Design a protein around this ligand. Structure first.
Ligand SMILES: O=C(N[C@@H](c1ccccc1)[C@@H](O)C(=O)O)c1ncnc2[nH]ccc12
Length: 167
């Protein structure tokens, strides 16, 4: 039993809700919140910009030190950093950005990072401003993630479309 509330159950291990991931993280304080990151951990917009704003830019400060030490992430890769005031940990995961021409096959690799954590609050990778089809992102999620994932979909209209088209 966990503290996530109001989710629709899609499969044995995937759950979905029309919610703002920032407000959802502040309420639940999950062990892991997933950020829709880029390789430079520049949290400028989309989910990343919103999560970082909620941390009063502390996420960005921590991320800049991480990059200065370690260099950029790989597309499809991840790193674990602090969750600040939102979660115990933030798993920064880099899905491919279609508006940068990156290989969508990397989406499966990106979701594989979720399997290193028993329970996660997450957005749909490569969705929104990353340019991929969110219905496809949800399919890859269900077919790749085996741990318990709670997906927050900001847009109510998108949320309803994802539920109604789900196979
Ligand atoms: O969910 C968000 N963005 C994603 C998204 C996917 C599909 C359709 C539209 C947008 C995607 O752009 C991403 O960045 O993962 C988002 N963006 C800004 N502020 C936010 N506050 C809470 C959530 C949230």
């Amino acid at each position: 039993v966990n503290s996530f509330s109001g989710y629709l159950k899609l499969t044995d291990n995937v759950y979905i809700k029309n919610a703002d991931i920032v407000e959802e993280a502040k309420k639940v304080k999950p062990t892991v919140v997933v950020n829709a990151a880029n390789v430079y951990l520049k949290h400028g917009g989309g989910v990343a910009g919103a999560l970082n704003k909620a941390t009063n830019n502390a996420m960005q400060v921590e991320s800049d030190d991480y990059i200065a030490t370690n260099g950029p992430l790989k597309v499809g890769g991840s790193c674990v950093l602090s969750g600040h005031n939102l979660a115990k940990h933030c798993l920064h995961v880099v899905g491919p950005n279609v508006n940068k021409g990156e290989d969508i096959q990397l989406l499966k690799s990106a979701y594989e990072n979720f399997n290193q954590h028993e329970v996660l609050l997450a957005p749909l990778l490569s969705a929104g401003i990353f340019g991929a089809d969110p219905i496809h992102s949800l399919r890859v999620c269900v077919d790749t993630v085996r741990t318990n994932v709670y997906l927050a979909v900001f847009d109510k209209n998108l949320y309803d479309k994802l539920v109604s088209s789900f196979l």
